[PDB]
């Protein structure tokens, strides 16, 4: 059989960046030829692999990550990057062998009043490790003063939401980001090209 194209890209519901969802795509055949042809995408990056010769290459297992971020935040989805998105929400290692895909969804993820359902982390004790998902809702103490209760000075709620308006700038417009990481163990016969 063939690997889920629609189940991942053409999925109706995408998660938020701080709560990105994994998708393990194993024991199947995948052709990236259909992906490269579509001109819908806005950024089709790859790291450690060739874009056009993806089709012929074979891996052990693949891990698709689904989430949505701002337009300016797409730049932060890369190895050795820093910022509110990379440090505290989603982080890629330096030895990242994979690809970064993101397309515009302002038409589909922006409301007339505005969409505020997409949220993002803004604070954390220490920076996240690669592929580390932290979804804890616990409030963090910026200042010295202990805050066992809830919001006040230097005691803040970790998250924040995006104002996605169709009249907002392209930098503020939403983008659906998918990140494919690859893996190779001793047994490599599971995923391969046409």
């Amino acid at each position, epitope marked *: 059989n063939l690997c889920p194209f629609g189940e991942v890209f053409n999925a109706t519901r995408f998660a938020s960046v701080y709560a990105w969802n994994r998708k393990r795509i194993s024991n199947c055949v995948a052709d990236y030829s259909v992906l490269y042809n579509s001109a819908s995408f806005s950024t089709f990056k790859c790291y450690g692999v060739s874009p056009t010769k993806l089709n012929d290459l074979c891996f052990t297992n693949v891990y698709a990550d689904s989430f949505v971020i701002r337009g300016d935040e797409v730049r932060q989805i890369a190895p050795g990057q820093t910022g509110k998105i990379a440090d505290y929400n989603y982080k890629l290692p330096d030895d990242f062998t994979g690809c970064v895909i993101a397309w515009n969804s302002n038409n589909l993820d922006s409301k007339v*009043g*505005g969409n*505020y*359902n997409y*949220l993002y982390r*803004l604070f954390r004790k220490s920076n996240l490790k690669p592929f580390e998902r932290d979804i804890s*809702t616990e*409030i963090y103490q910026a200042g010295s003063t202990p805050c066992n*209760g*809830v*919001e*006040g*000075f230097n005691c*803040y*709620f970790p*998250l*924040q*939401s*995006y*104002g996605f308006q169709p009249t907002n700038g392209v930098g503020y417009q939403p983008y659906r980001v998918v990140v494919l990481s690859f893996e190779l163990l001793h047994a490599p016969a599971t995923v391969c090209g046409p």
Partner: nanobody
Amino acid sequence: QVQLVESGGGLVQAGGSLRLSCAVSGAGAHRVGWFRRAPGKEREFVAAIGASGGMTNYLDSVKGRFTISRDNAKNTIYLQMNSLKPQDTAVYYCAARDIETAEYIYWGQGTQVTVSS
């Protein structure tokens, strides 16, 4: 900028209910919470609502007696108050947190709430 206007304060006997509102000057994508002015301590956190309406947060002394919600379409935020207590007598402010700094820079005048027994 961002402006706030409260309404629905007044006098209440022990028990009973109050539903305070808060009008907003076009602000969007802000976390909002309520602050009350008790004579003993004053200016303390009470409740908290996300812009999406999720990620609610309250007190533990008021956990389950107050319930916060909002109507972005109607551009206003409500605070339901049940089972009042002589401790809860206070002036109730409404606050808007800025996207960058979570310090609640935009405020409102606030109203009064009095509980007698």
